[PDB]
Structure formats: C-alpha cells, structure tokens
C-alpha cells in the first residue's frame, strides 16, 4: 500500500477578500411641477 503524500510547511500568506458590487448615487431626487403652466 502506497500513497502520494505532500509535506505540509508553514507559509506566509495575506488574507484579502473581494466583494463585488455596483455603484449607486448617494442620494436621489426628482424635479416636478406643482402648478400648471408653460415652461419659460
């Protein structure tokens, strides 16, 4: 009985994570009329 073992050794690694996402307006508002009329 034989197997393919690998010698585990201490390595120096960095822990970084990537979070996917979409950009979005900080705040949004709509412009609307509140009286009837013609745009000058």
């Amino acid at each position: 009985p034989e197997v393919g073992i690998v010698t585990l050794e201490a390595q120096t690694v960095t822990l970084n994570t990537e979070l996917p996402g979409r950009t979005n307006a900080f705040r949004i508002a709509e412009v609307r009329p509140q009286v009837n009329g013609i745009i000058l």
Partner: protein
C-alpha cells in the same frame, strides 16, 4: 477587504481534503509510525487551489493526495511524493 496577514499557517490543497455532511472538513495523513490517521481540520478560506487550515494539521504533517481513492485509517503505507 484587508483581513490581516497570517504569520505562518498550513495551506493544505483541496486535492487532499473532503467535506462530509456538506460542511465538516476531514483529512487523511500518515503519522511517524508510517500509519495513517484521521484528523478533523478547520479549513474555511480558499487560496488558489489550497485551503487555509486554521486548526487540524500542524507544520510537517504529510497529507495523502494521490492514493485516497482506496484506503482506510489505521493502516501503514509508502510515501511517494
């Protein structure tokens, strides 16, 4: 996100680890007595093709990768890189 830097830990390749119950991590290694044992590892992250074992395998241990296709714990074997 910067999750800090780990001093020195073991990065056991996934080609030598399994997840029973779709969660619990179990590995198969050969002790100094040329005999295989069954230790439960705590690998959560995934770097490249290896898994960062937080607690389950210390520095030095030998992880059986090519040969687990047919074996069992409590038996002896040969070590071929």
């Amino acid at each position: 996100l910067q999750e800090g830097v780990k001093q020195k830990a073991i990065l056991a390749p996934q080609q030598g680890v399994t997840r029973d119950l779709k969660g619990q991590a179990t590995a198969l290694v050969v002790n100094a007595q040329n005999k295989v044992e069954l230790r439960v590892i705590k690998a959560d992250r995934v770097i490249g093709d290896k898994w960062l074992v937080t607690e389950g395998l210390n520095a030095g241990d030998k992880i059986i990768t090519e040969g687990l296709q047919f074996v069992q714990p409590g038996v002896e074997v040969k070590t071929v890189p």
